PDB file of C-alpha atoms and ligand atoms in Angstrom:
ATOM      1  CA  UNK A   1     112.579  92.845 115.209  1.00 30.94           C
ATOM      2  CA  UNK A   2     112.335  93.669 118.931  1.00 29.71           C
ATOM      3  CA  UNK A   3     112.314  97.286 117.681  1.00 31.27           C
ATOM      4  CA  UNK A   4     109.914  96.861 114.712  1.00 29.09           C
ATOM      5  CA  UNK A   5     106.276  96.896 115.770  1.00 27.93           C
ATOM      6  CA  UNK A   6     104.671  95.666 112.545  1.00 27.10           C
ATOM      7  CA  UNK A   7     107.245  92.907 112.125  1.00 27.70           C
ATOM      8  CA  UNK A   8     106.597  91.849 115.729  1.00 24.27           C
ATOM      9  CA  UNK A   9     102.817  91.998 115.297  1.00 24.73           C
ATOM     10  CA  UNK A  10     102.998  89.892 112.142  1.00 21.19           C
ATOM     11  CA  UNK A  11     104.860  87.237 114.161  1.00 18.97           C
ATOM     12  CA  UNK A  12     102.211  87.270 116.878  1.00 20.98           C
ATOM     13  CA  UNK A  13      99.350  86.943 114.413  1.00 19.89           C
ATOM     14  CA  UNK A  14     101.048  84.458 112.042  1.00 19.23           C
ATOM     15  CA  UNK A  15     103.382  82.264 114.072  1.00 22.27           C
ATOM     16  CA  UNK A  16     103.508  82.577 117.855  1.00 19.29           C
ATOM     17  CA  UNK A  17     100.522  84.263 119.571  1.00 18.28           C
ATOM     18  CA  UNK A  18     100.742  82.240 122.764  1.00 18.93           C
ATOM     19  CA  UNK A  19     104.029  83.603 123.957  1.00 17.12           C
ATOM     20  CA  UNK A  20     102.489  87.099 123.855  1.00 19.74           C
ATOM     21  CA  UNK A  21      99.450  85.811 125.756  1.00 16.94           C
ATOM     22  CA  UNK A  22      97.260  86.181 122.655  1.00 17.99           C
ATOM     23  CA  UNK A  23      94.417  83.801 121.773  1.00 21.50           C
ATOM     24  CA  UNK A  24      93.460  83.453 118.093  1.00 20.01           C
ATOM     25  CA  UNK A  25      90.235  82.081 116.737  1.00 18.04           C
ATOM     26  CA  UNK A  26      90.508  79.436 114.044  1.00 16.75           C
ATOM     27  CA  UNK A  27      89.938  82.274 111.537  1.00 16.30           C
ATOM     28  CA  UNK A  28      93.024  84.043 112.935  1.00 15.10           C
ATOM     29  CA  UNK A  29      91.283  86.827 114.887  1.00 12.80           C
ATOM     30  CA  UNK A  30      92.850  88.392 117.984  1.00 12.13           C
ATOM     31  CA  UNK A  31      91.490  91.060 120.320  1.00 14.58           C
ATOM     32  CA  UNK A  32      93.459  94.275 119.798  1.00 15.88           C
ATOM     33  CA  UNK A  33      93.394  95.040 123.544  1.00 17.46           C
ATOM     34  CA  UNK A  34      94.886  91.576 124.244  1.00 13.63           C
ATOM     35  CA  UNK A  35      97.607  92.230 121.656  1.00 14.41           C
ATOM     36  CA  UNK A  36      98.453  95.552 123.331  1.00 11.03           C
ATOM     37  CA  UNK A  37      98.533  93.985 126.786  1.00 10.62           C
ATOM     38  CA  UNK A  38     100.755  91.159 125.507  1.00 10.56           C
ATOM     39  CA  UNK A  39     103.169  93.607 123.900  1.00 13.67           C
ATOM     40  CA  UNK A  40     103.294  95.663 127.109  1.00 12.95           C
ATOM     41  CA  UNK A  41     104.071  92.544 129.187  1.00 10.82           C
ATOM     42  CA  UNK A  42     106.891  91.823 126.728  1.00 12.49           C
ATOM     43  CA  UNK A  43     108.342  95.278 127.467  1.00 11.06           C
ATOM     44  CA  UNK A  44     106.684  97.500 124.792  1.00 11.87           C
ATOM     45  CA  UNK A  45     105.511  99.860 127.516  1.00 12.06           C
ATOM     46  CA  UNK A  46     104.585 102.674 125.093  1.00  8.09           C
ATOM     47  CA  UNK A  47     102.332 100.675 122.767  1.00  8.82           C
ATOM     48  CA  UNK A  48      98.666 101.735 122.566  1.00  5.96           C
ATOM     49  CA  UNK A  49      95.695 100.602 120.518  1.00  4.69           C
ATOM     50  CA  UNK A  50      96.017 103.510 118.023  1.00  2.86           C
ATOM     51  CA  UNK A  51      99.444 102.127 117.050  1.00  2.63           C
ATOM     52  CA  UNK A  52      97.992  98.689 116.252  1.00  2.00           C
ATOM     53  CA  UNK A  53      95.143 100.297 114.285  1.00  2.00           C
ATOM     54  CA  UNK A  54      97.726 102.270 112.267  1.00  2.00           C
ATOM     55  CA  UNK A  55      99.955  99.211 111.721  1.00  2.00           C
ATOM     56  CA  UNK A  56      96.898  97.685 110.066  1.00  2.00           C
ATOM     57  CA  UNK A  57      95.256 100.577 108.250  1.00  2.00           C
ATOM     58  CA  UNK A  58      98.488 102.152 106.999  1.00  2.00           C
ATOM     59  CA  UNK A  59     100.129  98.844 106.050  1.00  2.00           C
ATOM     60  CA  UNK A  60     101.272  99.121 102.411  1.00  2.00           C
ATOM     61  CA  UNK A  61     100.355  95.508 101.476  1.00  2.00           C
ATOM     62  CA  UNK A  62      97.062  94.867 103.268  1.00  2.00           C
ATOM     63  CA  UNK A  63      98.793  92.414 105.625  1.00  2.00           C
ATOM     64  CA  UNK A  64      96.124  92.911 108.282  1.00  2.00           C
ATOM     65  CA  UNK A  65      92.362  93.075 108.709  1.00  2.00           C
ATOM     66  CA  UNK A  66      90.341  94.851 111.422  1.00  2.00           C
ATOM     67  CA  UNK A  67      86.781  94.226 112.604  1.00  2.00           C
ATOM     68  CA  UNK A  68      85.202  96.047 115.646  1.00  2.00           C
ATOM     69  CA  UNK A  69      88.107  95.611 118.257  1.00  2.00           C
ATOM     70  CA  UNK A  70      89.736  92.623 116.551  1.00  2.00           C
ATOM     71  CA  UNK A  71      92.690  92.151 114.213  1.00  2.00           C
ATOM     72  CA  UNK A  72      94.118  89.323 112.109  1.00  2.00           C
ATOM     73  CA  UNK A  73      96.826  88.704 109.574  1.00  2.00           C
ATOM     74  CA  UNK A  74      95.326  87.940 106.142  1.00  2.00           C
ATOM     75  CA  UNK A  75      98.130  85.555 105.106  1.00  2.00           C
ATOM     76  CA  UNK A  76     101.564  84.240 105.964  1.00  2.00           C
ATOM     77  CA  UNK A  77     100.509  82.017 108.858  1.00  2.00           C
ATOM     78  CA  UNK A  78     102.393  78.990 110.054  1.00  2.00           C
ATOM     79  CA  UNK A  79      99.557  78.528 112.636  1.00  2.00           C
ATOM     80  CA  UNK A  80      96.607  76.709 111.001  1.00  2.00           C
ATOM     81  CA  UNK A  81      93.803  79.238 110.407  1.00  2.00           C
ATOM     82  CA  UNK A  82      91.211  79.837 107.711  1.00  2.00           C
ATOM     83  CA  UNK A  83      90.989  83.232 106.017  1.00  2.00           C
ATOM     84  CA  UNK A  84      88.352  83.681 103.328  1.00  2.00           C
ATOM     85  CA  UNK A  85      89.761  85.012 100.027  1.00  2.00           C
ATOM     86  CA  UNK A  86      89.013  88.438  98.569  1.00  2.00           C
ATOM     87  CA  UNK A  87      87.087  88.768  95.309  1.00  2.00           C
ATOM     88  CA  UNK A  88      89.205  89.096  92.215  1.00  2.00           C
ATOM     89  CA  UNK A  89      90.833  86.985  89.569  1.00  2.00           C
ATOM     90  CA  UNK A  90      94.601  86.514  89.604  1.00  2.00           C
ATOM     91  CA  UNK A  91      96.608  87.977  86.707  1.00  2.00           C
ATOM     92  CA  UNK A  92      98.339  85.585  84.290  1.00  2.00           C
ATOM     93  CA  UNK A  93     101.804  86.006  85.900  1.00  2.00           C
ATOM     94  CA  UNK A  94     102.648  86.257  89.599  1.00  2.00           C
ATOM     95  CA  UNK A  95     106.030  86.530  91.295  1.00  2.00           C
ATOM     96  CA  UNK A  96     107.773  84.544  94.027  1.00  2.00           C
ATOM     97  CA  UNK A  97     110.991  85.781  95.623  1.00  2.00           C
ATOM     98  CA  UNK A  98     113.481  83.249  96.908  1.00  2.00           C
ATOM     99  CA  UNK A  99     117.215  82.608  96.984  1.00  2.00           C
ATOM    100  CA  UNK A 100     119.567  81.357  94.331  1.00  2.00           C
ATOM    101  CA  UNK A 101     120.569  78.555  96.705  1.00  2.00           C
ATOM    102  CA  UNK A 102     117.001  77.241  96.617  1.00  2.00           C
ATOM    103  CA  UNK A 103     116.752  77.086  92.811  1.00  2.00           C
ATOM    104  CA  UNK A 104     118.137  73.576  92.133  1.00  2.00           C
ATOM    105  CA  UNK A 105     115.561  71.983  94.368  1.00  2.00           C
ATOM    106  CA  UNK A 106     112.776  74.234  93.100  1.00  2.00           C
ATOM    107  CA  UNK A 107     113.649  73.267  89.538  1.00  2.00           C
ATOM    108  CA  UNK A 108     113.322  69.579  90.475  1.00  2.00           C
ATOM    109  CA  UNK A 109     110.110  69.525  92.495  1.00  2.00           C
ATOM    110  CA  UNK A 110     108.608  73.034  92.429  1.00  2.00           C
ATOM    111  CA  UNK A 111     108.011  75.764  94.969  1.00  2.00           C
ATOM    112  CA  UNK A 112     106.817  74.172  98.195  1.00  2.00           C
ATOM    113  CA  UNK A 113     105.742  75.670 101.470  1.00  2.00           C
ATOM    114  CA  UNK A 114     108.329  76.370 104.153  1.00  2.00           C
ATOM    115  CA  UNK A 115     107.021  77.097 107.639  1.00  2.00           C
ATOM    116  CA  UNK A 116     103.933  78.784 106.140  1.00  2.00           C
ATOM    117  CA  UNK A 117     100.720  76.865 105.336  1.00  2.00           C
ATOM    118  CA  UNK A 118     100.759  77.971 101.698  1.00  2.00           C
ATOM    119  CA  UNK A 119     103.145  79.203  99.031  1.00  2.00           C
ATOM    120  CA  UNK A 120     102.689  82.954  98.625  1.00  2.00           C
ATOM    121  CA  UNK A 121     102.806  84.807  95.301  1.00  2.00           C
ATOM    122  CA  UNK A 122     102.665  88.529  94.597  1.00  2.00           C
ATOM    123  CA  UNK A 123     101.670  90.751  91.709  1.00  2.00           C
ATOM    124  CA  UNK A 124     104.408  93.247  92.744  1.00  2.00           C
ATOM    125  CA  UNK A 125     107.905  92.630  91.399  1.00  2.00           C
ATOM    126  CA  UNK A 126     109.256  95.097  93.999  1.00  2.00           C
ATOM    127  CA  UNK A 127     107.669  93.087  96.829  1.00  2.00           C
ATOM    128  CA  UNK A 128     108.976  89.764  95.490  1.00  2.00           C
ATOM    129  CA  UNK A 129     112.543  91.129  95.572  1.00  2.00           C
ATOM    130  CA  UNK A 130     112.081  92.481  99.112  1.00  2.00           C
ATOM    131  CA  UNK A 131     110.703  89.134 100.280  1.00  2.00           C
ATOM    132  CA  UNK A 132     113.546  87.148  98.742  1.00  2.00           C
ATOM    133  CA  UNK A 133     116.121  89.405 100.387  1.00  2.00           C
ATOM    134  CA  UNK A 134     114.715  88.512 103.820  1.00  2.00           C
ATOM    135  CA  UNK A 135     116.090  84.993 103.220  1.00  2.00           C
ATOM    136  CA  UNK A 136     119.259  86.812 103.354  1.00  2.00           C
ATOM    137  CA  UNK A 137     120.837  85.687 100.102  1.00  2.00           C
ATOM    138  CA  UNK A 138     121.361  86.407  96.498  1.00  2.00           C
ATOM    139  CA  UNK A 139     117.739  86.873  95.470  1.00  2.00           C
ATOM    140  CA  UNK A 140     116.016  84.950  92.687  1.00  2.00           C
ATOM    141  CA  UNK A 141     112.593  85.961  91.374  1.00  2.00           C
ATOM    142  CA  UNK A 142     110.394  83.267  89.842  1.00  2.00           C
ATOM    143  CA  UNK A 143     107.676  84.250  87.376  1.00  2.00           C
ATOM    144  CA  UNK A 144     104.785  81.832  87.863  1.00  2.00           C
ATOM    145  CA  UNK A 145     102.217  80.866  85.201  1.00  2.00           C
ATOM    146  CA  UNK A 146      98.902  81.211  87.065  1.00  2.00           C
ATOM    147  CA  UNK A 147      96.747  79.416  84.500  1.00  2.00           C
ATOM    148  CA  UNK A 148      99.277  76.559  84.546  1.00  2.00           C
ATOM    149  CA  UNK A 149      98.517  76.250  88.271  1.00  2.00           C
ATOM    150  CA  UNK A 150      94.791  76.199  87.632  1.00  2.00           C
ATOM    151  CA  UNK A 151      95.153  73.628  84.842  1.00  2.00           C
ATOM    152  CA  UNK A 152      96.874  71.443  87.469  1.00  2.00           C
ATOM    153  CA  UNK A 153      93.836  71.752  89.744  1.00  2.00           C
ATOM    154  CA  UNK A 154      95.445  74.100  92.232  1.00  2.00           C
ATOM    155  CA  UNK A 155      93.254  76.881  93.598  1.00  2.00           C
ATOM    156  CA  UNK A 156      94.911  80.290  93.605  1.00  2.00           C
ATOM    157  CA  UNK A 157      93.369  82.444  96.331  1.00  2.00           C
ATOM    158  CA  UNK A 158      93.587  86.214  96.630  1.00  2.00           C
ATOM    159  CA  UNK A 159      94.419  87.152 100.226  1.00  2.00           C
ATOM    160  CA  UNK A 160      95.223  90.852  99.715  1.00  2.00           C
ATOM    161  CA  UNK A 161      95.209  93.246  96.802  1.00  2.00           C
ATOM    162  CA  UNK A 162      98.610  91.906  95.681  1.00  2.00           C
ATOM    163  CA  UNK A 163      99.184  88.604  97.537  1.00  2.00           C
ATOM    164  CA  UNK A 164      97.825  85.232  96.382  1.00  2.00           C
ATOM    165  CA  UNK A 165      98.286  81.780  97.838  1.00  2.00           C
ATOM    166  CA  UNK A 166      98.572  78.292  96.364  1.00  2.00           C
ATOM    167  CA  UNK A 167      99.399  74.929  97.921  1.00  2.00           C
ATOM    168  CA  UNK A 168     102.382  74.280  95.628  1.00  2.00           C
ATOM    169  CA  UNK A 169     103.910  75.593  92.392  1.00  2.00           C
ATOM    170  CA  UNK A 170     104.877  72.676  90.097  1.00  2.00           C
ATOM    171  CA  UNK A 171     108.164  73.296  88.292  1.00  2.00           C
ATOM    172  CA  UNK A 172     106.316  73.195  84.944  1.00  2.00           C
ATOM    173  CA  UNK A 173     104.482  76.361  86.009  1.00  2.00           C
ATOM    174  CA  UNK A 174     107.650  78.417  86.444  1.00  2.00           C
ATOM    175  CA  UNK A 175     107.796  80.612  83.356  1.00  2.00           C
ATOM    176  CA  UNK A 176     111.039  82.496  84.003  1.00  2.00           C
ATOM    177  CA  UNK A 177     113.844  82.790  86.562  1.00  2.00           C
ATOM    178  CA  UNK A 178     115.649  86.057  87.283  1.00  2.00           C
ATOM    179  CA  UNK A 179     118.811  85.932  89.386  1.00  2.00           C
ATOM    180  CA  UNK A 180     120.135  88.897  91.389  1.00  2.00           C
ATOM    181  CA  UNK A 181     123.691  87.757  90.677  1.00  2.00           C
ATOM    182  CA  UNK A 182     123.092  88.384  86.963  1.00  2.00           C
ATOM    183  CA  UNK A 183     121.630  91.909  87.216  1.00  2.00           C
TER     184      UNK A 183
HETATM  185 CL1   CL B 201      97.351  81.861 105.712  1.00  2.00          CL
HETATM  186 CL1   CL B 202      86.576  76.900 107.632  1.00  2.00          CL
HETATM  187 CL1   CL B 203      87.468  84.352 107.159  1.00  2.00          CL
HETATM  188 CL1   CL B 204     105.732  81.714 100.771  1.00  2.00          CL
END
Protein backbone atom coordinates (compact mmCIF):
# COMPACT_ATOMS: atom_id res chain seq x y z
CA UNK A 1 0.00 0.00 0.00
CA UNK A 2 2.51 2.62 1.19
CA UNK A 3 4.77 1.02 -1.46
CA UNK A 4 2.19 0.65 -4.28
CA UNK A 5 1.69 3.86 -6.22
CA UNK A 6 -1.44 2.92 -8.18
CA UNK A 7 -3.12 1.44 -5.12
CA UNK A 8 -2.30 4.63 -3.21
CA UNK A 9 -3.52 6.87 -6.04
CA UNK A 10 -6.79 4.94 -6.28
CA UNK A 11 -7.33 5.64 -2.56
CA UNK A 12 -6.68 9.35 -3.04
CA UNK A 13 -9.06 9.62 -5.98
CA UNK A 14 -11.78 7.30 -4.60
CA UNK A 15 -11.81 7.59 -0.82
CA UNK A 16 -9.57 10.11 0.93
CA UNK A 17 -8.21 13.01 -1.18
CA UNK A 18 -8.13 15.52 1.65
CA UNK A 19 -5.45 13.85 3.67
CA UNK A 20 -3.14 14.12 0.64
CA UNK A 21 -4.10 17.78 0.24
CA UNK A 22 -6.04 17.01 -2.95
CA UNK A 23 -9.25 18.80 -3.96
CA UNK A 24 -11.71 16.93 -6.20
CA UNK A 25 -14.47 18.44 -8.26
CA UNK A 26 -17.90 16.89 -7.91
CA UNK A 27 -17.08 14.93 -11.09
CA UNK A 28 -14.03 13.47 -9.33
CA UNK A 29 -11.29 15.46 -11.10
CA UNK A 30 -7.98 16.26 -9.42
CA UNK A 31 -5.03 18.29 -10.69
CA UNK A 32 -2.13 15.94 -11.41
CA UNK A 33 0.40 18.47 -10.06
CA UNK A 34 -1.59 18.65 -6.78
CA UNK A 35 -1.59 14.84 -6.58
CA UNK A 36 2.19 14.78 -7.05
CA UNK A 37 2.74 17.48 -4.44
CA UNK A 38 0.46 15.64 -1.99
CA UNK A 39 2.32 12.37 -2.52
CA UNK A 40 5.66 14.13 -2.02
CA UNK A 41 4.45 15.70 1.25
CA UNK A 42 3.44 12.20 2.35
CA UNK A 43 7.03 11.03 1.76
CA UNK A 44 6.95 9.82 -1.90
CA UNK A 45 9.90 12.06 -2.68
CA UNK A 46 10.64 10.41 -6.05
CA UNK A 47 7.17 10.70 -7.58
CA UNK A 48 6.84 12.84 -10.73
CA UNK A 49 3.99 13.64 -13.09
CA UNK A 50 5.14 11.07 -15.72
CA UNK A 51 4.54 8.34 -13.11
CA UNK A 52 0.93 9.46 -12.56
CA UNK A 53 0.37 9.68 -16.33
CA UNK A 54 1.68 6.10 -16.67
CA UNK A 55 -0.41 4.83 -13.73
CA UNK A 56 -3.39 6.04 -15.74
CA UNK A 57 -2.48 5.29 -19.34
CA UNK A 58 -0.91 1.89 -18.66
CA UNK A 59 -3.57 0.78 -16.17
CA UNK A 60 -4.89 -2.62 -17.33
CA UNK A 61 -8.55 -1.92 -16.38
CA UNK A 62 -9.11 1.71 -17.36
CA UNK A 63 -9.36 2.69 -13.68
CA UNK A 64 -8.38 6.28 -14.46
CA UNK A 65 -9.14 9.10 -16.87
CA UNK A 66 -6.91 12.03 -17.90
CA UNK A 67 -7.85 15.41 -19.37
CA UNK A 68 -5.28 18.26 -19.97
CA UNK A 69 -3.43 18.21 -16.50
CA UNK A 70 -6.23 16.51 -14.57
CA UNK A 71 -6.94 12.95 -13.46
CA UNK A 72 -9.88 11.07 -11.94
CA UNK A 73 -10.89 7.57 -11.01
CA UNK A 74 -13.72 6.32 -13.26
CA UNK A 75 -15.34 4.17 -10.55
CA UNK A 76 -14.94 2.71 -7.09
CA UNK A 77 -15.55 5.92 -5.15
CA UNK A 78 -16.81 6.09 -1.61
CA UNK A 79 -16.69 9.94 -2.00
CA UNK A 80 -19.86 11.15 -3.76
CA UNK A 81 -18.96 12.13 -7.35
CA UNK A 82 -20.64 11.87 -10.74
CA UNK A 83 -18.85 10.13 -13.61
CA UNK A 84 -20.65 9.94 -16.94
CA UNK A 85 -20.87 6.38 -18.34
CA UNK A 86 -19.08 5.17 -21.47
CA UNK A 87 -21.07 4.11 -24.53
CA UNK A 88 -21.77 0.42 -24.80
CA UNK A 89 -24.36 -2.12 -23.81
CA UNK A 90 -23.60 -4.56 -21.00
CA UNK A 91 -23.33 -8.26 -21.88
CA UNK A 92 -25.99 -10.66 -20.55
CA UNK A 93 -23.80 -11.96 -17.68
CA UNK A 94 -21.44 -9.98 -15.45
CA UNK A 95 -19.34 -11.14 -12.51
CA UNK A 96 -19.02 -9.99 -8.90
CA UNK A 97 -16.25 -11.30 -6.65
CA UNK A 98 -16.89 -11.57 -2.94
CA UNK A 99 -16.26 -13.93 -0.03
CA UNK A 100 -17.94 -17.14 0.95
CA UNK A 101 -18.68 -15.58 4.35
CA UNK A 102 -20.83 -12.95 2.64
CA UNK A 103 -22.99 -15.44 0.71
CA UNK A 104 -25.76 -16.14 3.27
CA UNK A 105 -26.65 -12.49 3.52
CA UNK A 106 -26.31 -11.95 -0.23
CA UNK A 107 -28.67 -14.86 -0.83
CA UNK A 108 -31.25 -13.23 1.46
CA UNK A 109 -31.20 -9.61 0.32
CA UNK A 110 -28.85 -9.35 -2.69
CA UNK A 111 -25.52 -7.71 -3.37
CA UNK A 112 -25.49 -4.30 -1.72
CA UNK A 113 -22.92 -1.56 -1.68
CA UNK A 114 -20.21 -1.57 0.97
CA UNK A 115 -18.21 1.63 1.38
CA UNK A 116 -18.54 2.33 -2.37
CA UNK A 117 -21.45 4.33 -3.84
CA UNK A 118 -22.42 1.52 -6.21
CA UNK A 119 -22.10 -2.23 -6.59
CA UNK A 120 -19.43 -2.97 -9.19
CA UNK A 121 -19.62 -5.77 -11.76
CA UNK A 122 -17.03 -6.93 -14.28
CA UNK A 123 -17.02 -8.74 -17.59
CA UNK A 124 -13.67 -10.37 -16.64
CA UNK A 125 -13.83 -13.57 -14.60
CA UNK A 126 -10.11 -13.16 -13.81
CA UNK A 127 -10.73 -9.68 -12.38
CA UNK A 128 -13.71 -10.83 -10.29
CA UNK A 129 -11.52 -13.48 -8.62
CA UNK A 130 -8.74 -10.94 -7.96
CA UNK A 131 -11.24 -8.50 -6.45
CA UNK A 132 -12.79 -11.11 -4.18
CA UNK A 133 -9.36 -12.16 -2.91
CA UNK A 134 -8.73 -8.60 -1.69
CA UNK A 135 -11.46 -9.25 0.91
CA UNK A 136 -8.99 -11.68 2.09
CA UNK A 137 -11.11 -14.81 2.20
CA UNK A 138 -12.23 -17.86 0.39
CA UNK A 139 -13.46 -16.21 -2.80
CA UNK A 140 -16.95 -16.62 -4.24
CA UNK A 141 -17.82 -15.42 -7.74
CA UNK A 142 -21.43 -14.46 -8.46
CA UNK A 143 -22.71 -14.56 -12.03
CA UNK A 144 -25.26 -11.76 -12.39
CA UNK A 145 -28.17 -11.70 -14.87
CA UNK A 146 -27.91 -8.20 -16.38
CA UNK A 147 -31.31 -8.18 -18.08
CA UNK A 148 -32.84 -9.29 -14.76
CA UNK A 149 -31.39 -6.08 -13.28
CA UNK A 150 -32.86 -3.99 -16.07
CA UNK A 151 -36.26 -5.68 -15.75
CA UNK A 152 -36.16 -4.56 -12.09
CA UNK A 153 -35.63 -0.95 -13.20
CA UNK A 154 -31.98 -0.77 -12.22
CA UNK A 155 -29.69 1.12 -14.58
CA UNK A 156 -26.45 -0.69 -15.37
CA UNK A 157 -23.77 1.84 -16.28
CA UNK A 158 -20.52 1.14 -18.09
CA UNK A 159 -17.67 2.92 -16.31
CA UNK A 160 -14.72 1.27 -18.09
CA UNK A 161 -14.30 -1.26 -20.85
CA UNK A 162 -14.95 -4.09 -18.36
CA UNK A 163 -16.48 -2.50 -15.23
CA UNK A 164 -20.19 -1.71 -14.82
CA UNK A 165 -22.08 -0.30 -11.87
CA UNK A 166 -25.56 -0.82 -10.45
CA UNK A 167 -27.22 0.39 -7.26
CA UNK A 168 -28.04 -3.12 -6.01
CA UNK A 169 -28.20 -6.70 -7.29
CA UNK A 170 -31.45 -8.39 -6.13
CA UNK A 171 -30.91 -12.02 -5.14
CA UNK A 172 -33.26 -13.11 -7.96
CA UNK A 173 -30.71 -11.75 -10.44
CA UNK A 174 -27.89 -14.01 -9.25
CA UNK A 175 -27.68 -16.74 -11.88
CA UNK A 176 -24.87 -18.86 -10.44
CA UNK A 177 -22.49 -19.02 -7.47
CA UNK A 178 -18.95 -20.40 -7.73
CA UNK A 179 -17.04 -21.04 -4.51
CA UNK A 180 -13.23 -21.13 -4.31
CA UNK A 181 -13.46 -23.82 -1.63
CA UNK A 182 -15.05 -26.16 -4.19
CA UNK A 183 -12.52 -25.70 -7.01
CL1 LIG B 1 -18.23 5.87 -8.72
CL1 LIG C 1 -24.41 15.55 -12.25
CL1 LIG D 1 -18.40 13.10 -16.04
CL1 LIG E 1 -18.42 -3.27 -5.41
